[PDB]
Amino acid sequence: KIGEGTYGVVYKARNKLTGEVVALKKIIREISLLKELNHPNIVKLLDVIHTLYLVFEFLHQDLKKFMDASALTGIPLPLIKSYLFQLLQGLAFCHSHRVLHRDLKPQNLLINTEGAIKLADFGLARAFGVPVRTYTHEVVTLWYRAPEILLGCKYYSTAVDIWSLGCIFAEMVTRRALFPGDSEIDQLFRIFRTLGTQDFSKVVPPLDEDGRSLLSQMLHYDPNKRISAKAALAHPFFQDVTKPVP
Amino acid sequence: FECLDAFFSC
Ligand SMILES: *CC(=O)Nc1ccc(NC(=O)C*)cc1
């Protein structure tokens, strides 16, 4: 079927009884312990079999296709805040379990009609690492990678994911990509030309001051000084998004 | 939610 996600091809050839309806993707095995993770903002891994087959919860439509359809109409600010809040919830859950994505981009942010947004393809940044363009036929989007991975710094941390979630954030406000680079060196040049003037006034105009503060904190070039999902959830940007638990 | 309605019904 339709599907081409980051590391393999996703579709639905079989099904198995009881109206299973899943997404099945073809591409150590500690990704089998990702089956034990449960969070409303994470696409649940149902099963995994090496012969390898991943079977994810089927959600069509991803944040990229939504932003593409919402290109001219834009996205309501409460919906942007809700998506960013849910993605930060998922990132905090994954980082508390020492699980990185290391290559977030809007194509692995699945959405449903209920309004929920879930992180997909997560924690498998070891099955052929993170994609890189070695051949001229390969594409590989670099628009959302943290500068430390772009350079080639070998030590990756949770701070990379935040950086990605930062870029996507700005994108949802402009449905124009923040750092649309076409090589590693051009990506670094764009990043450090933007960051080296930086309140994010001209680059994300429609975003209020709380939003620009949260964005600049999510887009610190230094990964050790980049904001965490925990601290970002406590940002005054989410003052009207936070609601008690019952 | 109206934005979602329109997008998913598209
Ligand atoms: C696809 C279509 O016919 N209409 C459509 C899709 C998406 C959106 N996006 C928002 O409203 C934010 C509008 C209209």
Author numbering:
A (entry chain A): 9 to 35, 49 to 72, 76 to 221, 246 to 294
B (entry chain B): 1 to 10
Show sentences the authors wrote.
To target disease-causing proteins that are inaccessible to small-molecule or antibody therapies, we are exploring the use of a nature-inspired drug modality that exploits the intrinsically favorable properties of synthetically constrained α-helical polypeptides (Helicons). Analysis of 14 high-resolution crystal structures of Helicon–protein complexes across six different protein domains reveals a range of binding modes, all of which are “side-on”, i.e., mediated exclusively by Helicon side-chains rather than involving main chain amide interactions. Biochemical and structural experiments demonstrate diverse functional impacts by the Helicons which bind these sites, including inhibition of protein–protein interactions, inhibition of enzymatic activity, induced conformational rearrangement, and induced dimerization.
Whereas the ATP-binding pockets of CDK2 and CDK1 are highly similar, their surfaces share significantly less sequence identity, allowing the possibility that Helicons that engage the CDK2 surface may be capable of differentiating between the two family members. We solved cocrystal structures of Helicons from each of these clusters, FP19711 from Cluster C51 and FP24322 from C52, revealing two allosteric binding sites with respect to the ATP pocket. Consistent with the selectivity observed in the phage screen, the FP19711 binding site is found at a region on the CDK2 surface where there is high divergence from CDK1.
